[PDB]
Structure formats: structure tokens, C-alpha cells
RNA sequence: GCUGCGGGAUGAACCGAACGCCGGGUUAAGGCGCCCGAUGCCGACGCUCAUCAGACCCCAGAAAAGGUGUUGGUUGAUAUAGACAGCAGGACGGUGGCCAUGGAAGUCGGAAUCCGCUAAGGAGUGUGUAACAACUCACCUGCCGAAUCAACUAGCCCUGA
């Protein structure tokens, strides 16, 4: 609608990011270690969905040398929910495998099914926190083609930083 | 010595690369390593390919400098590169290599039995010719 | 930057945030050569933070677009302006490159500066890229490639490293 | 089985790399004409490095310790020793499989010699750079057998000419036989299926 | 320390990564001429010849300075109103100017600094005479013929070592 009028256009900055942890365990400052504990990245190659916010971006700026975070696509959300969908009841993470588990545990908010779960993770609604707490942190394998140096940011041809659409390529390599 | 050289308006074979076995034609040299090549009728698109990627031939064309695809095609059809290229031994060598790649086991059996028959006849004739050479050189 | 592979040209426009002290920001525009758009956006923030009172937090990028070549099928001449940082002190530089496209010419510029002057992607700041025509090239290399009916053979052309068998009765000739 | 390699126009490190890789697999390789193996760089530098290699010796007893061969075949054999794991019974068996000769032995006069294209001077070196000859280096330092090896080399070159003239005569005779008639019935099959 | 494992040949601290027993796949740190698993890609661009080449954080060696050895780069200056080089010729008069006496008569020395002929002469760039003399240069002209010169700068290599 804007290029016909000759004007530019900017889309909305998305409110949902995916965070994979890249670096290891030992040799880690407590200032970033506590943020990784709050982002549920206690091991290496685990990922979470983060509701983007000023507080969340100022969290991620502390742990930029340790994570790779980006804007996941619809199938980037969908393959992570289908293929490696693990939830938790109280303890004891169980693979989803049926709509009855989600309808029994998480479905108190009209979110009883996996279509509802994918909709709530992708389009960040008013009940995103319950879905993010229900989802176990996604254990992911090492990528196929490899990684780029793991220490410099993606601006410097590295891995530890923001890439904003290339995390879709990263999740097609890893997942 | 140095019968061939790159030139504005020379057809060239392509040995290595994604367009192998396809003739291109040099339009102009960019800088020392790559030349803007073009293909009017050899199913290859106008691009820049390296000199070590291409292979020089002997036939030349009267291209103007940086002419259109239309003028390249007109000079190609005026020079008649396709029939004259089929009517040489080098394309017969490439065609024989392709036919050896496209052999089968029954074809190899026929080649081997014809090979046995020809080599027996050649061996008998070489024996007869050296016997005749000794009979000629004996007086 | 990394300058990995061939480079790409991006038109990036960016402005400040709309503030009640001063609305309608001037919406500046730059031409960034970068391997992808994320590095283009970051290098845009770098140059505009050098030039004017701008940063990533108090500003935004309106549009970041790929700039395709106006004539890829034409062998053209490009003058590149350089602000490279050497070991002792930084220096300005004018270079000339005969190549097809602008992104390929700037790619050859990065590769050639890294070859001769040991300049990384950290130190090279492309000031301006401009297509120049014939009879304006300052350089003798591009001036001697300016030849109609140009002739040269390829003497001593050796190739096919072990594509042939490693052990043969041949003794391979050149040209 | 056996891989009889030429040495005329090859490089020391490249030929040693290819021989030391192909001798661990079991192919019994023999490098003949070892006096003609070229070495890149300047000849003064090559003999200076070889003089430093001679200077490296044990001071308490030079016999019990560093041995320094002067013959070029043993130079190449030491070059392949320094690349194979000769302190174990894999590289030791590989050096037992490897045979090296200066000049050309009488079985290798008859057997055909191979030429490695990956180790050639023309393929690997720029033609305006300096080089050396390992036989020239060996005659300059130690190996006093250039005048005998060159004489026997000229003798076998004369033998190779007097064999090649007969071979070319027989090739002319068999191509006269191929020029003759009544062989084309099989050629109708053969030219179609790759003459 | 209290800690194995993969690289750094070898290693307490380095770089990844932390350890129940195994199979399959993948990867980091690192590497793909042979040891020693992997570039045996018809890999791309350019630099380097080193008579002590060079080869990966800690890490196991080196500086100030110099190079008409090559490669870029900046600032300038010349040139058909025929330049830079080369070969040849001119290179004066006032005036052996002036302070100087052992001498300066352009040439140890201090201050200066103009005109005529002009094709051009600088009260003179150097060699030489104790000085007087000869030679050469700034500048000009004869032949040739279109690109040339100067000062800085940084990459490899060399001397310094
Ligand atoms: Mg660490
Ligand atoms: Mg793989
Ligand atoms: Mg890596
Ligand atoms: Mg670190
Ligand atoms: Mg203790
Ligand atoms: Mg502890
Ligand atoms: Mg180790
Ligand atoms: Mg070490
Ligand atoms: Mg395993
Ligand atoms: Mg191997
Ligand atoms: Mg020490
Ligand atoms: Mg220099
Ligand atoms: Mg040095």
C-alpha cells in the first residue's frame, strides 16, 4: 500500500524470539550464569521461546556472547512443537504425543490442543507465560553444516548474536 | 607457434564447470582471468567464465565489440559453426568418449569379438608382410 | 565485517525516533556493501553513529533492501574510495576495478586490499563507489585492458591436478 | 603390483609424498633415475642445507649415531624414511617394500617406467624460478659415481634408440596392414561402438 | 589445586568442553602433502625469490635505522609554445666587486645581490692552484623523439642480526 504511493513502510518488530545456547558451562561469569538459569539454558544446545520486551532484550544483551537468538518463522515454531515437543506436568517431562495431556495440564485457558499451543507460542497472546512454562526447554542436536567460530557476533561472521532470519536456517540444520 | 589466442569473436570449448561440453564465444576480456562469454545456439547463457575454465579452439567469428545476443546469433548462423564443428575429428573424439561411456555389456561383447577377429587378421598380415620383407631383402 | 564470499549491495534508510521535541526525522539513506542484510544494518548503525547523533536505541531503520545491478551484462569500470586503517596510521585511497557488477567490484576491492595491504574488514571503510567511463581511468592496468581488438594467448597453461591418474606413461604438455 | 617410476623431472618432496602414501597401501613402488630428481630453490642454498645436514653429527661418536648418505638414491630413501613411521612394523615393512636405484637396472631397462604428473617440475613450479639436480648435488658432495652412471645411461639410451627404431618400423608395418583392405566389416561395429 | 577428554608435537593455568558402560549420527577448539583420521575441490584474488626466506593468543626470540629489490597510495612539478636521458657547443662584460694583505682574480672565510648582451651566465654547484690558470655544473642551444621526474607513505623480502 505504500510503494504505490511512493512512501516507505516498516513492519512491526516481532514480540517472539527463539534462543539457543551456544557456549559451554565452565568458565562462565555469574552475571551471565544467573541469566542463563532464568532463561532455562542450563545445558548446551537447548533452546527456549522468549516473549520479547525491553526487559527481555536487556537480559539478552548480557548473554550475547553465550547465546544465538533470532526471530523464528512459523514452521520454525511448528517443527519444534511437533518433533521435539516435551511438556511437564509438575516434574517428569513427557513427550506431548496426544491432545489429552495438553487438555489435562495446560488447557485451563481455552488452550486445550496443539493448534492452540502453536497459536499461543507464535502469536504472543495473554497466556504466553503458561505455555512457555509448560514447554520443557528444547534439547537440540548439533547442526549439520557446522557453526561459524562460536565467539564473535553474527555481524562479524560469527555465531553468538542476533541474525533475525538465519535462525530459521539454523533450526533447519539442527532440528 | 601460438596459432591460437583469445580474441573478440572466438568460439571456445568448456571443459571444466557447470557448462561442460558446451561451446561459448568470447566477447571481451574483463581483467586477465575472466572473459564475458556468450552462447547463441549452444544452450549456454551469456555470462563471465574464466580462461582456465574454458578451452580455446581454432574457429573465429566477426563479432563487434560487446554486441547484442542478436548480432552474436547472426554471426553464428553466418559462420555455420555447428555443421563445420560436427565435421571435424575433435568432435568425433568427444563423441567416441561419450559412446564409450554409453556402452553396455552386449556392446562390449561385440567389441571384444570384433577385436579378436581384427587382431588375428592384423597379426597374420604383419607376419606375411615381414616374411615378404625378408624375402625381398634376401637377394 | 567478515566479507564472506561475494558481497551484496543494500540500500538502507534510517531515522530517529519521533520525539515531541522534534518530530519528522530527516530519514537518512546509505548504500552499504555487506554479505547479508543483518551485517548491512549493523554497519549502517556504525556509519550513522560516526556521522550524526544516532544510535540503535534512539533510532530505527525504515527499510533495508537488496540493490540489484543496473546492467550485469556490461563490463564496467568502478572507482572505489577507501579509508583504510594501516598499522601506523589510517590513509585514504582511490582504486580502480574493471568488473561486471558493483558488488563484485567491491568484493574484489576487499580481496585485493587484504592481499596487498594486509587490511582486514575491520579497517576498510568504503567511502564512495562510482562507475567511471573510459579516458578517465588513472590506472595503467585498467588503461591497458582498454584495448579494442585485444589479443593474448595463454602460455604455460597447466591444469588437472590428479584428475588424470597419478601413475601414467604420459608427460603432459602445455598449450 | 610393481610401480616403476621415472625420476627425470620430478620434485623431491612431491614424489616422496606420493611414494610414501602409495607404499603404505602395499603397491611395491620403485623410483628409478633418482639422480634426475629436481629440487626447487637455489643450488647454493641446496648444498648449504646439505652441508648443514652433514654438520649435524654426534660429537662423542659419529659412527654410533647420524649416518649421512651421499648417493641420491639413498638421499631419497632417507627422505621417505623421514615420512614413514619407520620405528614401527608398518613403516619398516613399507621401507622393506620400497626399492630405490641410481641409473636404471637391467630389468627396469625392459620394464616400462611411469611418470607422475602431480610431482613434475613443469606442473608444480613456475618456469622462471631456480632449481637444482640431485645428481649434481650428489656429485658435488660425496657421491663420486657420476661418470660411471652417465656412461651406462648413454649406453642404455643407445639401446633404447636401437629398440625404438625397430618398434617404429613394426608400427609402420602394422599401419600398412590397417591401411590394407577387408577389415572394415568389424569396423562397422567398432566405429559405432567407440573405435 | 579437587579434573579426566579433543586440539596447542611435548604442557597446571591456554582454546573448546567437563567424565556411569556402549551403538548410530552431528559438531566445537583445531586441521585436511606424509607420518596422522580429513581438500586427491580441474577452489578464487593478489604479494613474496629471502647465500640466515616463512609457517597460527599465551608460545619459546628482536628493535631504532636503511634499500633505484618489487607491489599499491598521497602530494606535486614538467612536456609539441618538442620535456626527461644521451651525444656536442656556449657558459661573458661591468668586476682581479666589496670586509680581508699569507692569499680569494666566481672557488678559506663575514655582510650581500644589480644592469647590458641576451641563445645564457647564477657577484656563482663542485674539482684543482698558496693565489694567477684549465675542467665541470645552474641556465641556453644543435640531433633524437613522447611520456618523464621529485618528495613522502605501507604490505612482502633483505641489511641491521
Ligand atoms: Mg573455555
Ligand atoms: Mg557430513
Ligand atoms: Mg570451525
Ligand atoms: Mg573465552
Ligand atoms: Mg594440597
Ligand atoms: Mg571444584
Ligand atoms: Mg592433548
Ligand atoms: Mg607447542
Ligand atoms: Mg560416537
Ligand atoms: Mg590421509
Ligand atoms: Mg620457557
Ligand atoms: Mg619500501
Ligand atoms: Mg630477517
PDB file of C-alpha atoms (C1' of nucleotides) in Angstrom, chain A residues 23-26 141-144 147 149-150, chain E residues 4 15-18 25-30:
ATOM      1  CA  UNK A  23      28.754 -21.706  24.517  1.00  0.00           C
ATOM      2  CA  UNK A  24      29.567 -24.193  27.254  1.00  0.00           C
ATOM      3  CA  UNK A  25      29.321 -24.485  31.037  1.00  0.00           C
ATOM      4  CA  UNK A  26      32.676 -23.910  32.736  1.00  0.00           C
ATOM      5  CA  UNK A 141      21.354 -31.633  18.336  1.00  0.00           C
ATOM      6  CA  UNK A 142      24.493 -30.135  16.856  1.00  0.00           C
ATOM      7  CA  UNK A 143      23.956 -28.643  13.365  1.00  0.00           C
ATOM      8  CA  UNK A 144      24.735 -30.450  10.132  1.00  0.00           C
ATOM      9  CA  UNK A 147      28.942 -23.334  13.069  1.00  0.00           C
ATOM     10  CA  UNK A 149      33.548 -19.726  15.161  1.00  0.00           C
ATOM     11  CA  UNK A 150      31.040 -19.532  18.109  1.00  0.00           C
TER      12      UNK A 150
ATOM     13  C1'   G E   4      39.595 -36.643  33.214  1.00  0.00           C
ATOM     14  C1'   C E  15      41.318 -22.822  23.378  1.00  0.00           C
ATOM     15  C1'   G E  16      36.795 -25.925  23.363  1.00  0.00           C
ATOM     16  C1'   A E  17      34.354 -28.951  26.647  1.00  0.00           C
ATOM     17  C1'   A E  18      33.679 -31.013  31.930  1.00  0.00           C
ATOM     18  C1'   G E  25      24.503 -39.624  13.539  1.00  0.00           C
ATOM     19  C1'   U E  26      26.456 -34.498  14.200  1.00  0.00           C
ATOM     20  C1'   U E  27      29.795 -30.673  15.989  1.00  0.00           C
ATOM     21  C1'   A E  28      33.066 -27.315  18.868  1.00  0.00           C
ATOM     22  C1'   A E  29      38.792 -25.998  19.622  1.00  0.00           C
ATOM     23  C1'   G E  30      41.620 -27.448  15.642  1.00  0.00           C
TER      24        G E  30
END
